[PDB]
Design a protein around this ligand. Sequence first.
Ligand SMILES: CCCCCCCCCCCCCCCCCCCC(=O)O[C@H](COC(=O)CCCCCCCCCCCCCC)COP(=O)(O)OCCN
Ligand SMILES: CCCCCCCCCCCCCCCCCCCC(=O)O[C@H](COC(=O)CCCCCCCCCCCCCC)COP(=O)(O)OCCN
Lengths: 539, 541
Amino acid sequence: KCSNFFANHWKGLVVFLVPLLCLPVMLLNEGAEFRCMYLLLVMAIFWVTEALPLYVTSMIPIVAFPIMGIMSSDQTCRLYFKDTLVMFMGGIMVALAVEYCNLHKRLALRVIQIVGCSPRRLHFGLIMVTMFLSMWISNAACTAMMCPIIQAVLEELQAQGVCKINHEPEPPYPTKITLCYYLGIAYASSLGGCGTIIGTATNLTFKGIYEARFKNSTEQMDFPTFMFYSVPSMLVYTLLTFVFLQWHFMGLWRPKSKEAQEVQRGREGADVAKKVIDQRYKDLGPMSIHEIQVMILFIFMVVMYFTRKPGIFLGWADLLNSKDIRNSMPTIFVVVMCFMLPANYAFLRYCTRRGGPVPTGPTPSLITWKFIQTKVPWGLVFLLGGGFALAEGSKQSGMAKLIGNALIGLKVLPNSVLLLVVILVAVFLTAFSSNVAIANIIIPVLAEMSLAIEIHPLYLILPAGLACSMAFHLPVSTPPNALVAGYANIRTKDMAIAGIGPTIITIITLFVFCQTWGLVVYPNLNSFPEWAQIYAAAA
Amino acid sequence: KCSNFFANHWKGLVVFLVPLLCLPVMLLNEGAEFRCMYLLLVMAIFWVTEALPLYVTSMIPIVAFPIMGIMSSDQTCRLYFKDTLVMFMGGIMVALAVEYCNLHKRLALRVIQIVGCSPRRLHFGLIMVTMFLSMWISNAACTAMMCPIIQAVLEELQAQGVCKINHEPEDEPPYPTKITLCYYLGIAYASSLGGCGTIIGTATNLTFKGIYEARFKNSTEQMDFPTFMFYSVPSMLVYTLLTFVFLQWHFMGLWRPKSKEAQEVQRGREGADVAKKVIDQRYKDLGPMSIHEIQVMILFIFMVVMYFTRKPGIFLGWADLLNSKDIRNSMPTIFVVVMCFMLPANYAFLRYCTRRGGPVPTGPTPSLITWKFIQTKVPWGLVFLLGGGFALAEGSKQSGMAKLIGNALIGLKVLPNSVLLLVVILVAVFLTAFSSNVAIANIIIPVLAEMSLAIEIHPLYLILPAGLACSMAFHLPVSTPPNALVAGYANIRTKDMAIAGIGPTIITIITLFVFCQTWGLVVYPNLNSFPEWAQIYAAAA
Ligand SMILES: CCCCCCCCCCCCCCCCCCCC(=O)O[C@H](COC(=O)CCCCCCCCCCCCCC)COP(=O)(O)OCCN
Ligand SMILES: CCCCCCCCCCCCCCCCCCCC(=O)O[C@H](COC(=O)CCCCCCCCCCCCCC)COP(=O)(O)OCCN
C-alpha cells in the first residue's frame, strides 16, 4: 500500500517539497548572492532528478531574475538565442538537408563496400562510419540512421542459417553477436560526438560558458583549433573500444573459445551472403544532381569554417573588418541557398535545348519548410539559453566569489591528481543524468575554483567538458543507450558489464593526451597566464 | 519560350533577377543608408511576391548586416528573440492548454447559446467582443486568446452542415474557405482597430504621447486618459461597423441575393430553430466542469488580470512596487506556462491518506499539458519572422536610413492645410505596411512637430491623425503581429489578405480625415487657431 505511493508519485513530492525546504538559505542571509544560490540549488535538483521536463525547467530564470534584483526582463531574454546557438540551429538544419535526399546511406554503403566482407571487417566498417557521421549529426539521429542496415544483414544471415539472432527459449534474450554490433554502434555514436563543436550540444555549452566568462583569453576554442585538439584522441580510443568489444564477445585472442568458432563459421560461406545483401541494398540509383549540389554546399560551409581567421594568410573576416562576422554568416547562408536553388535543371529545354519532355510545373527546391518544422528539437533553445543565463546571473550576483573563496582548500593537491578526480567526478555524475545538465552544473564551479587556485582554467575545463559525454553503463545515461536497448531487448546487467571497457579506456586516454599533446596544441597550459592573474586580482 | 515557361517558373525568375535589377540603387550612391535601402527593397519584393517562404526571407538580415558593415553578428542575432517575442510565444502556449482541456468547446457552446446560432449575428458579436476586450490589452494577446474560440465555433457550425471549413484537395496545407477567411481576418482587423481606443490599448499611443509631451511642455492642451478616450471612441465605433459591413459583402453575399454564399447563409437562417435544440442538448451532453478545466481557467484569469494591472496609469500597479529592475509582461506568461506543468490534472493521489472510499490512482498523475503537444502545434517560424521585424527596425535606425526618410518629408510644406493632412495620413499608412508601428511613429512624429511649428498651425492638428494612422496595417503578414498570428494559425495566403485589406484602408482613411476636422473641434476648441505657447516656441526656434 503506502510503499508504492512513493513509487508512483515521488516526482510530485520532489516538486512540492524542495522549494520549501530550501527557504532557510534565502531567509537566514541577506545578500543577493544567497537568492541566486537558492535558485541554483532548486534548478540543479530539478535537472538531475528530471521532476520536470528539462526544457520547462530551463525557463525558470526568466521569471526568477527580474522578481529578484539580479537582472531586468529584457537582458534575460536576450541572453537566450545568442550567436553560437544560431550556428548550432543552422547546423541542425543543414544536417537535415543532407538526410533528405539520402546522402548518408550512399556514403555508408560505399565505405562498407570498400572495407572487407568478413564479420570483423564489417564491424570495423560500421564503427568507423558511425563515428565519422556522428561528427556532424546528433547522436540519436546517427544511431537511428545506422541500425536498419545491421538489422537487415542479421535478418538475412539468420534466414540462410549462418547464425542465430536470439537464444532459444519475456522477450527473447539476444545473442553475443547482436549485442556486439548494436553496442558498438551505440558506443561509436557517443565517441564520435566529441570530435567537433557541432557534433553534440555539450561542446557548445562548455565552449559558450568559457567564452562568456573570460572574454580577454588569448587561447581560443574556435572551430579549427578545437578539432585539432580533439581528433587524435577520438581516433585512439575509438580504435581501442573496437578491440575490447571483439575480445569480449567474439573471442579475438582465444582460438579454443566457442565465440571464435562462430566467427569462423561466419567467415566461410556468409561473406558472399552479406555482400549480396549490401550490393542489392545499394539500389539507390546513379548519383543525382540534387545530391551533388547538397554535397558541394556542405563542403563549402566547412571550408568557410577553416578560412575565417588562420594565421598563415589573412582570409576573410579580416578583409571584412568593419564588424565581427563570427561563423553565423556561412551557416545561414547555406540554409537560405538551399531554398533558392532548384533540383532538376530540366527547364533549360525551353531555352534552345532539345532534351526531352518539359516540366509540368514548378521545380522543387533542395528542401521544404515542413520537413524542417517537424524534425528539429526546438526545446534545445530553452535548454542551452537557460544554461547561459544561469551562468551569467551567477557571475553578476556575486555567488562566484563566494564559492571560489569557499573551495580554496584544495590547493594542497598536485595538479595531476586534481585532474584525475575532476574526470572521475564528471564521469560518475553523468552516469545518471543528461550530459547538458551536468555540464551546466559543473563548468562554472570549475571556472571559479580554477581562479581561486593558481591554475590555468582551460587545463581543467576542457578535459572535464569532454568527459561529460562518456556514458556507457545505464540506459538512462544517454539517449542512444535507450534506443539500442529498445531495439534489441538488451538487459541492463549486460550493458553495465560491457561498459567497463570504454570507461577505463577513455579515462586513461584523456588523462595521458591532455597532459602530453594538448601542450603541443596549447603551449601555455602549465603556467598561470597574465590575464588570469588580472581576473583573480579583480575577484 | 512558350507562355508556360512564365506560367510555371516565374518565381525562379524573380529570385534570380530582382537582386541584379535593384543593384544600381547601391552602385550609384555612396553611403551605408543606400545599402540598407537596397536590402529593404529586395526583401519587400520577396515578401509581396512570396517567391520564398516568409520564414526563410526573414533570415536574410543575419547574413546581410555583418557583410554590409551595418552592425555586428552578435548584435544582430540578439535583436531577434527580444522580450516581446517571448511574450508572444508564451501566449501561443497558454492558448494550446485551453485547447487541450476542451475548455474552448464549452465557451463556444455558451456563446452560441447566448447569441442564437446564425453566421452574421455571431460574426458581429465576436467582432464587437474582440474590439471591447482589446481596448485594454495588447493586440497580440487578444488574437492569441480568441483563435481557439473561433476554431470551435466554426467546428460547431460545420457539424450541422451549414458550411465547410476547408476546400477538398502534398505539403501545401488546405486552402481555407470564404467564411473561415471572414472570421479570422475579422478578429485580426478587430484587434488592430480596437487597439486605437485608449492610451493603454497599444504601445504606439504611449510612444507618440510621450514624444509630444517631451517636446512641448507648457502646453495648454492635454492628452490624459479621459480626454483621449473622449476624442477617439466615436471614430473607432465607425471604423468597426463599416469594416464589418465590407467583410460581409466581400466574403458572404450581403447586397447580392444571387450570390451562392448568400443562399448558404439563407438556408442556415431557416433551420436555426431546430439547431437551437441540438445545441442546448449538446451542451448538456458535456458534464460539469472538471478540476482540470477549473485550474486552467483560474490561471488564465490570473494572467489577464496581471496584464491589465501593470502600470495602468490610473493607479499604482505592481510594476512600481518592484522597481529594482524593469519587469515586463513576459514574467506572468512564463509563470503560467511553468505552473501548467507543475500542477496535477486530477487530485486522486490524496485518496491514499484519509480517503478510504476513493480508489488508488495506480499510475503517475498527468499534468495540465505535455511537452510533445507543444512541440507539434506551435508554429516556430514566427520566431524568425517577428525577430526579423525587430532587427530590421533597429538596423534602419543605426544605418541612417531613418533620418533620410524623415528628411524626405520636409518638402511637403508647400501644400495647403487640408491637402497636407491627407498626404500625411497617406504617407503614414504606406510606410507602416513594411515595418513595426513604433519605428514608424519614431521616424515621422518629430518631423511633423517641427514642420507644424514652422508652418504656423496647432501641432496636435497634424500629430493626432498621423499617430492614429500609424496603427492602420491590413495588407501583409509582416505589417503587424496579429496578421502574422492569424496567417500561422489558419493557413492564409498573402494574396487573399492583400486583396481583402483594401476595404479597411479606405474606410479608416476617409473616416479619420472627416472626424478629425469635425469632432476634434468640439473636443479641442482652439485646434483651428494657432495658440500663444506655440508662438513662444516658434519664436524660440
Ligand atoms: C519572501 C517570499 C518567499 C516566497 C517563497 C515561495 C516558495 C514557493 C515557490 C512556488 C512553489 C509552488 C509549488 C506549487 C505546485 C505544487 C505541485 C504539487 C504536485 C503534487 O501534488 O504531486 C503529487 C503528490 O503531492 C503530494 O503528495 C504533496 C501534497 C500536494 C497537495 C496539493 C499541492 C498543490 C495545492 C495548490 C497549490 C497552489 C499554489 C499557488 C502558488 C503527485 O503528482 P504526480 O507525481 O502524479 O504528477 C506531478 C506532475 N503532474
Ligand atoms: C559589390 C556588389 C555586390 C553585388 C552582389 C549581388 C548578389 C546577387 C546574387 C544573385 C544570385 C543568387 C540568388 C539566385 C540563385 C539562383 C536561383 C536560380 C533560380 C532558378 O533557376 O529558377 C528557375 C528559372 O531560372 C532562370 O530562368 C534563371 C536562369 C538560370 C539560373 C541558374 C542558376 C543556377 C546556376 C548558377 C548558380 C550561381 C550560384 C552563385 C552563388 C525556375 O525555378 P522554379 O521556379 O521552377 O523552382 C524554384 C524552386 N526554388
